[model samples]
Structures are given as structure tokens and as C-alpha cells.
Target: STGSATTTPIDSLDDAYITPVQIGTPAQTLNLDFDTGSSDLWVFSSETTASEVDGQTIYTPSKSTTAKLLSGATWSISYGDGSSSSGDVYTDTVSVGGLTVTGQAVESAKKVSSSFTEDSTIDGLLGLAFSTLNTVSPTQQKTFFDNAKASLDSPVFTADLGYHAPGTYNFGFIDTTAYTGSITYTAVSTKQGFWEWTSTGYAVGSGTFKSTSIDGIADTGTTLLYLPATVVSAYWAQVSGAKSSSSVGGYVFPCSATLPSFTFGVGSARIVIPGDYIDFGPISTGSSSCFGGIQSSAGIGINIFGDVALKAAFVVFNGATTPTLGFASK
Candidate 1:
């Protein structure tokens, strides 16, 4: 039992990649942010405040014959920035890419912060991360991946995030054609309930490779790649007039400057990110400067290999009793 789904850039900037999901009976389709960094299948639903609904699609559990209220069950997902959303729970038939999980727990937002309400692109978030990090209280519910693992031919999922184009999320097996070269397997340490791993080191463009340990998580929910300040500084220093700015946002430089490619090592394998991708985009419309895709992870407390890095390679989230991660160039 395997499944495949198409995911596309939600905006021109590739801020996020969204996948279509079917929830409840008669199938109310919602374009959800398929995030591998968090664990909770939450949605903007009929229970949400009318004023907060905005233009995002809502899931009406009452209309679904298969929807069953999880009485007394409630959930609240908080962010590091201090914003949050909370609501009641429901168990319903949910499907992703034709992979069905009967009686899957679905958290419906009753209230959300203004920031969340204003985002009109995403209807909800589908978490494929480990269940240990699930925000549901009373009894923590399994993630979509955990609930469907038994039905899959193999306990694994792959992320092929596109660079300003369409991509895919595959379950059960790896698509050999999706990547070239041999897959490099590495151990994952879920100490923080994240798909975290250690990177060997990095190189700035065609420059020298620095040998160091960079512990980071492969986060699909995050938009940029964050590394140590030293590494980030080294990369930026290569470009003339590049500077870290508080007002301009992170690292910014000449939009048309000769940007060099960045590379990170994983065990014996090295993955290179094109300079064009790192240029990110202009700081503002008509601006001559652009923000860097790689930023310092000092404040974050940990390095994060986000979409900026993932888009350049094919990633595998192997869900075994003892799990491992696989990375390969595409």
C-alpha cells in the first residue's frame, strides 16, 4: 500500500508548498501546508470564529457523516513567537494522496491569533512529523504518518520539494527516478522529537570546506536555512557589500551581485545549493538588495535545514523502530 501526491508552491516566492487533503465524508478538500516539522493535523473549521475565518477553507465536521466528536478532548498549539490557536477535537476519515487513515484525529480551530487568521493561503497544516511532538493533550494522538505506517509497504516517506515549481510527497517507497547518485543514509536523533541530524561541515561556493559539526533538523515548515553565525558570515563575506541588517531583515546584499553557491556536507556526501537560490529575492519590490536564504542560527539555538536546502535534494523520512534519514542529489 503506497501513495503519491502532487504539491505546488503556494506563492511565487515558494514561501510554502501545499498539498490537497480529503477530510470527512463526501470529501471536503483543503489545500494544507504539509509540514514535517510539527505534529498535529489541525484545520480551520466551522467551529472557528467567523471573523477569523478570512478566505481560508473551513472543514465542517457536522456535514460529514464519518466525523465524530472526541468529547472532552481539546488542543492548543503555541508558537515560539507567542501566538497560538486552540480548539476541540474530532475523529474522522482523512486521506492524503489516496492513503486513507480511518478515524484519524483532527483538531478544529475554535480561535486563532490575528496573524493566523489573516493568512488566506493555507486552510490547515498536515503534520507528518513524529507523534511524540503532538500538541494534543489528555492522550496524544498519532501523526498522519504514524497512523498510516502499518498500511504502507514500508514505513517511510519522501520529500521532493521543488524550487519555484511543482514537487511531490511520496509514501511507502522511494522513487528511484526522483534522484541521481546513490542515497546517503544517516542516523537520526529524535531527542527533541524532530528529524534532527548532524551535518559534517560546509563550503562557500568553490571555496575550502570547513570541518565542523552542525546539528540541525530537516524542517519543511521553515522557509530558510539557518546555520552557525561563523558559517553564515563566511558565506556572506564572499559577496561585496553584503551585510547583516536588523532593519532590512537578516543578511542582505546587492540583488544583482555575483553570488556564489553554498554547499553542506552529510557524512561523505556533499550537497550544493545554487547561488541563484541563495539570492532568495529582493528585500522589497524595486529594491536593489536581496535577503539571503541562509541566516545565522545563533538565536534559534539550533541549525535548521529548511526548504532552502531541502529543495536542492530528495529527502527520506524513514519511520522504523530505529529510524534513519536518507539524502540524495536530484
Candidate 2:
């Protein structure tokens, strides 16, 4: 009736989270990034060119007797960060945390960008976003969560992302032990095909809490927090040596600076991200200037509450017919 899957941060930055997934009849296991930002269950596969394949694991459909080619099906997607990939599609038995979703569309990659090939830790992305966002041309398919929602005890899944540690993703049920106090639920606007919600307000450190709404999407795939220009600048202003570093690509400050905590509201449930989490390491290899985990979403045109913010709370991706998001203190 439900399932639980443990996810691990791929690196010290907790850049991406990967969960073990079993594919095919014989259960060929692979580590997949459970991404809520996009809707396409794509994988680096045997069909991918050798040059595009790095040290990452690849799924071979031919090796699985249950894998059936979805002829004439193809997909191509470009991420917000500008990474692009294309692939053919197949359907196979897939399970994560023992939650089975059979005949799931498995997009087999034919080509992936340089960054994807170089990232050895992530085998593929298992999109949890609305199936409406799927890029499969001719015929799009439902995500693992979508395919499993009806049979699930509840049409909900939760993301418990950790800071440089192991976390867990629970499907169909909520783990009361994972969070404290009460869950604060908020309305979500899926008009753009994302887990988009509005933060009630925000505070810079122990300072004043600005009663201004911030709209953003919950993207587990994204590594940092992106807010409006006003919010980004306000947060960075408190830091003494902070400045825009086009060279480093964002705001950078002296590593030794005493960073302040950031607090954002979720229906009056304030979620605080520690100062240490905001100091997202150095700009260069062992450099003195560190990049800010919170950046402006000016370029992307949409604010993103990524790992930086999500890690601070227990996020429930409530996949109801009319979906809503819930945040809880942890």
C-alpha cells in the first residue's frame, strides 16, 4: 500500500540526491535522481553513444526481456540550467522502494550533454513532476508517482532531503517521526507544470520579516535557492564583503564572514536555513571567496526553492487530482 526509499547526497554540496531503483524483470538496479522539477523518466542507456557515456551506470533495455520498445516515441528536453538531452522510449517494469509501477515509460538516452556525461554519480532522473510536463513527443507518459498514485494508500509522496547525509523518500504515506509540530499546507499552481507555491513571507536573520509573498517552484533537482532580485540582494546585503561576481557567476563573499540565517514562511510555518547552509563553499578550488547558496532567479524568470530550502523542511509532494504542497518542521 506504500513504500519508502532511502536517498543519498551525491557529493558534499548535496548537489543531487539519488535513490536506488529496480528496472526490468530481473531487477537491474540503478541510482536515479528523483527530480520533481522535470517530468521525464530518462536514463543514460546502452543506446547512448560511447563518447557520451561516462563512468555512470547505463540501463540496457535489450538485457531485459520485459522491456518493450515504444516505437516512434522520442524525447528531448532542455533543463533550466541549459543541459540538454534526447532519447528513445521504452516501457518496462520499474520499482523504487519496492513500490512497483509496471510498463513505465523508460526513455533511453541517445545523447547527453558534456556536464551530464561527466557527472558519474547520477545515472538518470526519475521525474516526479506532473506528467503534463513530460517531453516524450507523439505520446507522453505518467511518472512513477503518477502511475502508482491510484493504487497507493494516499496520493502523496514526501521528500526528506538531508545535508551531506542520507535521506528518504516515502510514497503513499507520511512518516510522523520525520518531522515535528504540525504540517502547513499551501495551494499549488500547476499551470506551468511544477510544484509551484507561494511563500507567505521571509526574514533576513533575526531581523524584520517582510510580509511579501514569494512565488517559486519546489525543485529537488536544483542545488540552490533562487529568489526574486529584491530578496537575493537583501539577504546578501547583510554580508560585509559580499558583491556580485560575474566571474564566479553570482554573489560571493569572504569565506570567514559570519553568515546570517534565512527564514521563509509557509502558511505561517517559518522554515529557517542555517547560515552555514547558505555559505555554499568557495568560488574556486580552495578560494577565499565563497558563493552564496541563495541567488537571484532573474535569469530563469521563476523562483526556485531548491535543495537549499527543501533540506530545511519535510516537503510533501501531495499528488492529489488537485495537488497541493505541505511543509513541516524537522
Candidate 3:
């Protein structure tokens, strides 16, 4: 049977976009971040210490008749931002939108890092990345998408991430209405367990496009766009008073600065990120400084085309024989 699902953002975390998902026989609903960066359906659960959990909702496996504990199985994961979680494993029926997968591996968090504990809106993470990245120890697990792909009409999914506004993550099929123009397809290398691709060139604002191939991954879990140090420097040079701040972290400029649009090349297709999107907003609540959405991927190894970049386009995560990424203007 062909099935599809759609997801919407929860709060204004900007860092992670949360979607509603159901688990177990009785259907315990939880808001999960649909992360393409990693694989593992880990949730804040009953096993989590009372003091460790704040306002975040926890998945109570005992409440679900269909939940089957995978005794001795465990899982742990850490994000690029240093946020991490670890826990036991259970096989339960997981449903997203209208798409459901029977006996999906659901990791129950026994411990979560401060970064995850503080995020009250995010209850768990639903990894849409390759199943090879699943972190369940002893025996790695398959992602919900992986388990459901065979039954889907087409082995593909689409992500339409919006800025502040609610967007959708579509499964099994692509919604033609979500994007405009022809979808530009680029070959992806899944060796790194990511939607990795190379940019043939890029440009800052209306300036001439420079031929600089940059390797990066499309990561929904990350909030900002991270590029090479040279690319970041070139973009910031156009903005007056912009500087790399150690205290503020990354590049910061005056809140009132008129920034330039950043464009990246994917084969022959160019994805343009508007200037307004580059300014990630004020450094803090009352700070007059603003953080640059595009930062340097110095030690992070591969650059990241995070939410800031993804939100600018409608992306198709094609899981065909040769996994490719299709991008189109929204």
C-alpha cells in the first residue's frame, strides 16, 4: 500500500524543526525533530530521570500495548552542536502523518545532554538520514523511512523548510505544488552517511560567481549554513562592521547591516540565499549585534547547508539506486 505523511514545525527554536509522530498500539504522540543529518528514532522517555526532564514530553512505553522492549539493546547519539542522548531500545509501531511503520526501532532516552534537556519543545529525533547511520549498538537499527520505503509509491521524500513559518516534510511522494521551476538534480555521495554534494561555484550578492568547489552536506538538524572559512570571509567582507567574534561565537555584524545574498552552485543550478536570511537575528535577546547565518566550518570537516539554506528551496531527497538531491526554488 502506498502511504504518505506531512510534518510541521513545533516552536521557534530555529535550531531544530519538530514534527508530530505517533508510537505504540494506543498511539502515544510526541513531537520529534525530523533530522536528515543522523539516523535514530530516540525520544525522551519514562526511563529519563524526573529531574533531568524539564517541560519536554516523554514517551511512556508501558502505556503502549504494542511496545516490545529489545532487551540489552542500547543507543546513543551526539549532534554537531554537542547535544547528545542515550538510552534503551524498543520495537513499536511508529506513525508519521498518515504513514505508519510496524515494529520500528524506538530508542528511549535514559540520559540526555543539557542541550537536549533544555529544549522543552523537542520530545525526540526522527532521523530521515540513511539507515546505515542508525546508532543502535550491538545491532544497528533501520530508520522509519527505510522500513517504509518499500511500500511507498516512490522511494523519495521532500523537505520544505520555512523560516519561522510552518513548512512540511513529505514522505513516499513528492508534492509538485510545493515548488516552482524544474527540479535540478545533483548526485550525492552517501559514503559519509549524509546527503553530501559538491558546489561547482558560489557568489556573494550581485558579485561575480567564483569557481570554488565546496563539499558539504544538507543537514536539517543544524540551524545555520556553514561554509569554508574563505567563503565565509568573502561573504562577510561585503557587510560593514562584520567580524569573527570569539565571545559571540562565529561571525557577527550590526543588526542594521545590509547583507548580501549568498548563492551556491549545484551542478548548473544556483541556489540563492537572500540577504535577510543570512542575518540570523540578534546575537541575544537585547544585543545590538546579529549573528551571521553563514559561518565557517573550520573544524567541522564538511560544510553544512543547514536550515538557513534548506528553507530557501524545496528539496527532494531521492533514494533511488543512486541517491540524488533535487532542488527547486520555492
Candidate 4:
């Protein structure tokens, strides 16, 4: 079920042959989860002897001119999905965009047999999430951003998930190609691992304010946005011919009519998730449609703004030189 330890370093977007720049590198590239729930940069490697990695992309140390393995520092990780992997420590030069981060230490999985790795497409995860989820155990909790703080230009790594067909997630400097002027930000609540923010309420048409109050987190690891039951119900009530059906695991509105645009205020910053993204696809069993951006979280306690939200704005992970996350536009 497992194998030996391994390491895979990453290159810049201009130099990588991996997946499109946004989702991260392809097989040979570093496939990071970029989560706000954890902090780590791990990869599947050449030394992994697990059979699950039969066709997966592994890092060949020989292929890298600057790979460094930490023989004594071994590692293993488990996800909420009930999957797990074990490995060793290693370091190398990692390049992203115009910035080159050196001496980036990562866990090289010696054996990764997690059910999550069934898809060879995902080589390994780079936890861009938070330090609270660092699996470093009881004492030392170091995030990749913490280790590479010196190499970063401003001790801040901004993520701009572009609007282009293939979205772009850039780090280092905040690309101002999208938005101008200073970005309004709120103080981060240190209570959870996710990047939780306070939402004042929802805006219906013409950005009209709704009375529902909600608190949610920006999570990149999740595919869809998970909202509270009350907030979801109230918002859907406003949609024309809005009807709730269990067709797509959530509320669906069958009518082909366009839904109202919903905007949520994060502190002073207001963001709008387009109508199309809210309805990813029609409900399977019902003529009713399922809202893409808004869905029930099965009572998960907090609302989660997944990839859909990340696509709307630029996110920054501050590893704490000045030690704060910075947000801007692309």
C-alpha cells in the first residue's frame, strides 16, 4: 500500500509543462491543493514504491539539478477524505511567475496509497491553506510560506484566479491588471484553519442588501461554495420560479431563466458571483436547476466559499514577514 520517499520541485508558469497555469502544474508539475485549511508543499516522488503511483507523475531527483533530500526528516499525511500518504523531507528551488523561491522544503511521499490519489492527475498537494493545518505534529509547525518567507518579495503571496478561459493564480506581487485602487481587507479571525471572513449580508438585484447575516471561509480545496441553509433558502426564494428539488444534491431551479446576481460583503470589500457560476448544471432528476455557487453544507457549522469564489477575486497568503495576507486584482 506504500513505497519509498520522493521529491518533485516546481518551475515557473513560463517554464512548466504541467497543467494549465491556474489549477497548478501537470504530472511533472507540482499539483498543489492551495488550501487555506493547511500549510505544506508536498509531492509524489520517483522513490515512491506504492503500486497506486504506477501511472502517476513522480519527481525524479536525477531530473532536478538542485534537489536536496532530508534523509532523517520523514513524513506522512492524512486528509478528511480518509486517505493517507507517508514520505521523507526534501528541498529544492521552486519558481512561480517571475519570482523564484529557493530552499523550499517539502515532504516527498515514499508511499502514498490514499484513495484520493486514484486519479493520477493529482500528483500531490501543496497546502497553501494555513499554518493551523500543518501536520508537523505537537511542537514545530512550519508552513512553506513560513520557510520561504525570505525568498518572497514582500512576505506576501497574492493569488489571482484569472477570468480568462484558463484562469491564472499568480503569487509574489499583486497583479493589478484586473482591479485598480487599494483593496479593502478585514482582520482575519484566528479561530479556524480556513480563511474565514465575516459576510454582512447578501445583495439581490442592483446590489440590493438582504437581511440574512452569514459568516464563511474562502476555501480553495473545495469545488463548490457551501452556504448556510437559511441563507441559501432566502436567496433562492427571490429567484423567478425558484423551487427546491433534491436533483443535484442541493436546491435546483428548473426554469431556464437567468437568476438574480448575488453579492456578499466581506468586511468592506464586496464581491459578486455571476449567475452562470451559481447554476453550474441543471439538476439531474428534476427539471429544476441547481445553484452552482450556493449549496447546502450538510450542517458543517461554517459556510465555505470554494473555487467559485476564488475565481472572482485575488487572494493573498501572507507568510508573515510583515506577516499578513495581501489581496489585490489581476
The best candidate by TM-score is 2
Give the per-residue lDDT of model 3 (tens digit) for 85-160: 8999999999888888998999999999997888788998999889899989889999988898888889988889
Question: On residues 1-330, what C-alpha lDDT tens digit does candidate 4 reach at each position?
Answer: 111112121221111112211111221455544555556666777777766575566766656767776556766677543578877766666544334445666667777765545655566666666666666533334665555556555566555453323444445445566565556665566566666666667775465677555777766655566777776776687777766556445666755768766677655566776666566554544544544457777657778877656556666655552334444433
Candidate 1 lDDT tens digits, 101-211? 998999999998887787788888888778998888788999889999999999999999999899999999999999999889888998888899998999999998988
**Model 3 CA lDDT for position 31:** 91
| Local distance difference test, candidate 4 | 0.57
Best by lDDT: 2
Residue 308 shift from truth in candidate 1, angstroms: 0.1
Error of 2 at 198 (Å): 0.7
The candidate, 1 or 3, that scores higher on lDDT is 1
Error of 2 at 5 (Å): 0.8
Better of 2 and 3 by lDDT: 2
lDDT of 2 by residue, 207-313 (tens): 98899989999999999999998999999999999998887889999999999999999987899998888877888798999989999899889999999999999
Report the CA-based lDDT of candidate 3 relative to the real structure.
Answer: 0.88
Steric overlap count per candidate: 0, 0, 0, 20
lDDT values, one for every candidate: 0.90, 0.93, 0.88, 0.57
**How are the candidates ranked when ordered by lDDT, highest leading?**
2, 1, 3, 4
TM per prediction: 0.97, 0.99, 0.97, 0.75
Residue pairs with clashing backbones, model 1? none
Query: Which residue pairs does candidate 3 place in steric collision?
Result: none
Clashes of 1: 0
Q: How far is candidate 1 from the true structure (C-alpha RMSD, Å)?
A: 1.2
Candidate 1, residue 314: how far the Cα is off, in Å: 0.4
The C-alpha RMSD of each candidate to the native structure, in angstroms, is 1.2, 0.8, 1.3, 7.1
